[PDB]
Design an enzyme around this catalytic site. Structure first.
Site, PDB file in Angstrom:
ATOM      1  CB  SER A 183      69.897  31.380  18.296  1.00  0.00           C
ATOM      2  OG  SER A 183      71.296  31.479  18.490  1.00  0.00           O
ATOM      3  CG  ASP A 212      73.270  24.382  16.377  1.00  0.00           C
ATOM      4  OD1 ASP A 212      74.229  25.088  15.998  1.00  0.00           O
ATOM      5  OD2 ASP A 212      72.232  24.866  16.870  1.00  0.00           O
ATOM      6  CG  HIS A 239      71.933  27.826  14.491  1.00  0.00           C
ATOM      7  ND1 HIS A 239      71.889  27.519  15.832  1.00  0.00           N
ATOM      8  CD2 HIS A 239      71.773  29.165  14.404  1.00  0.00           C
ATOM      9  CE1 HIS A 239      71.709  28.628  16.531  1.00  0.00           C
ATOM     10  NE2 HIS A 239      71.634  29.643  15.685  1.00  0.00           N
TER      11      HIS A 239
END
EC number: 3.1.1.23
Length: 310
Positions: free
Chosen positions: A123, A251, A281
């Site tokens: 991320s 996601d 995610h």
């Protein structure tokens, strides 16, 4: 509270501390522990917003079993590095300046062993990782880059439900030190309720504070890659360095669109995007055993391919 669902199979390293530029960084060196001794390479892990060392335990444990050293550190504004006041307090300069310090540290330690140093990020850490490949001082010395659902553009689901994530960068310049807790999107983070329960109960995960300055900087960081103004990626990406992005198809936090376009724009000859059906995610840390195994095996095989000698 709810227990950590994963059982570590190797010996968990000492949580170690090191001072740099006015911060006490907590870090870990995870050695290869598979009976044979030898090391194929070391992977530098750049955690995401709200994450810390324990979150990457699952990854480092499996890497250790398969002949790969790991190095991770709680970044400025996160983890045990910046508690209380300093939680969420960082900016673009510190993000990369701190990174260069730990890159050179591992580069020095890998120099003696003659082993390759790879860079991994999830991320926010993914956005940092892909950007380092364009702007890093030692971008041509990194043996490979791995992105885990990198923060390039937020998914519409997140932008619609958490509009504060749009307002905070907008108000950053004016009010940079305002810190904010938007709460964890447990359903968006993972599909496994076991890790969901742990994350929601974890004292090191909740509450999660981020400053407007911090938030703006990693939001802009990813947007810069997505817009790719004047072929920034083509011009600055470390020439022909192997890239691979792994991203859950489901996601709804970071849009897969960002990873798809990045691979398209990337000038490297060795580049690849892998999308994982049914995954969400946090595919490398908090997802189901089924998802993690599929995801990690691709990374493991990818690493082997770029450490294959004879």
């Amino acid at each position: 509270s709810a227990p950590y669902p994963y059982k570590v199979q190797t010996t968990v390293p000492e949580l170690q501390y090191e001072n740099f530029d006015g911060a006490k960084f907590g870090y870990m060196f995870w050695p290869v522990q598979n009976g044979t001794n030898e090391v194929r390479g070391r992977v530098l892990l750049i955690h995401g917003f709200g994450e810390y060392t324990k979150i990457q335990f699952r990854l480092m444990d499996h890497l250790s079993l398969n002949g790969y050293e790991s190095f991770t550190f709680d970044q400025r504004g996160a983890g045990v590095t910046s508690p209380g006041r300093s939680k969420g307090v960082t900016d673009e300069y510190h993000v990369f300046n701190d990174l260069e310090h730990f890159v050179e540290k591992n580069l020095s330690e890998c120099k003696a062993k003659g082993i390759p140093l790879f860079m991994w990020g999830h991320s926010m850490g993914g956005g940092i990782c892909l950007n380092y490949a364009c702007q890093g001082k030692h971008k041509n010395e990194i043996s490979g880059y791995i992105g885990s659902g990198p923060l390039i553009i937020l998914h519409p689901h997140t932008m619609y439900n958490k509009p504060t994530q749009i307002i905070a960068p907008l108000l950053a310049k004016f009010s940079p030190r305002v810190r904010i807790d938007t709460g964890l999107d447990l359903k968006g983070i993972t599909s496994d309720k076991a890790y969901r329960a742990f994350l929601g109960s974890d004292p090191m995960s909740v509450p999660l504070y981020g400053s407007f300055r911090q938030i703006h900087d990693f939001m802009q960081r990813g947007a810069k890659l997505y817009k790719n103004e004047n072929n920034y990626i083509q011009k600055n990406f470390a020439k022909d360095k192997p890239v691979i992005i792994m991203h859950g198809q489901d996601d709804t936090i970071n849009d897969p669109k960002g990873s798809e376009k990045f691979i398209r724009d990337c000038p490297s000859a060795d580049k690849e995007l892998k999308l994982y059906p049914g995954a969400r995610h946090s595919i490398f840390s908090l997802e189901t055993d089924k998802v993690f195994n599929t995801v990690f095996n691709d990374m493991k095989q990818w690493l082997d391919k770029h450490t294959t000698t004879e």
